[PDB]
Amino acid sequence: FTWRKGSLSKVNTCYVLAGGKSKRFGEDKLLYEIKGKKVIERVYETAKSVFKEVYIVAKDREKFSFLNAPVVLDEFEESASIIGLYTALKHAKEENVFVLSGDLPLMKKETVLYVLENFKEPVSVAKTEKLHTLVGVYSKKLLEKIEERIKKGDYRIWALLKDVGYNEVEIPEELRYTLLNMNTK
Q: How far is CA 76 from CA 16, 20, 86, 102, 132, in A?
A: 17, 9, 10, 18, 23
19 known ligand binder: yes
Closest by CA to 102, choosing from 77, 124, 72, is 72
Amino acid, res. 178 = T
Closest by CA to 73, choosing from 82, 64, 175, is 64
* Contacts with 183 (C-beta within 8 Å, 6 or more apart), sequence order: none
145 known ligand binder: no
Report d(CA 63, CA 69) in Å as an integer.
Answer: 11
CATH number at residue 182: 3.90.550.10
Domain assignment of residue 69, given as a range: 1-185
74 known ligand binder: yes
Report d(CA 124, CA 168) in Å as an integer.
Answer: 6
Q: Rounded to 5 degrees, what angle do the CA atoms 154, 158, 161 make?
A: 100
18 known ligand binder: yes
Amino acid, res. 185 = K
The torsion angle over the Cα atoms of residues 112, 103, 63 and 86, rounded to 10 degrees, is: 60
Count up the domains in the chain and report the number: 1
Amino acid, res. 36 = G
Closest by CA to 44, choosing from 9, 71, 22, is 71
* Contacts with 170 (C-beta within 8 Å, 6 or more apart), sequence order: 127
Closest by CA to 109, choosing from 35, 171, 48, is 48
For residue 174, report the phi and psi dihedrals to the nearest 5 degrees. -75, 0
Report d(CA 177, CA 172) in Å as an integer.
Answer: 10
How determined? X-ray
* Contacts with 100 (C-beta within 8 Å, 6 or more apart), sequence order: 14, 15, 16, 17, 43, 47, 107, 112, 134, 135
Q: How far is CA 9 from CA 113, 114, 130, 142, 153, in A?
A: 9, 11, 25, 20, 34
Residue 158 neighbours by CB distance under 10 Å: 12
To one decimal, the resolution in angstroms is: 1.6
**CB-CB contact of 37 with 66 (8 Å):** yes
Instruction: Please give, one letter per residue, the 3-state secondary structure of the chain.
Output: CCCCCCCCCCCCEEEEEEECCCCCCCCCHHHHHHHHHHHHHHHHHHHHCCCCEEEEEECCCHHHHHHCCCEEECCCCCCCHHHHHHHHHHHCCCCEEEEEECCCCCCCHHHHHHHHHCCCCCEEEEECCCEEEEEEEEEHHHHHHHHHHHHCCCCCHHHHHHHHCCEEEECCHHHHHHHCCCCCC
88 known ligand binder: no
The torsion angle over the Cα atoms of residues 48, 54, 60 and 61, rounded to 10 degrees, is: 80
Report d(CA 161, CA 73) in Å as an integer.
Answer: 24
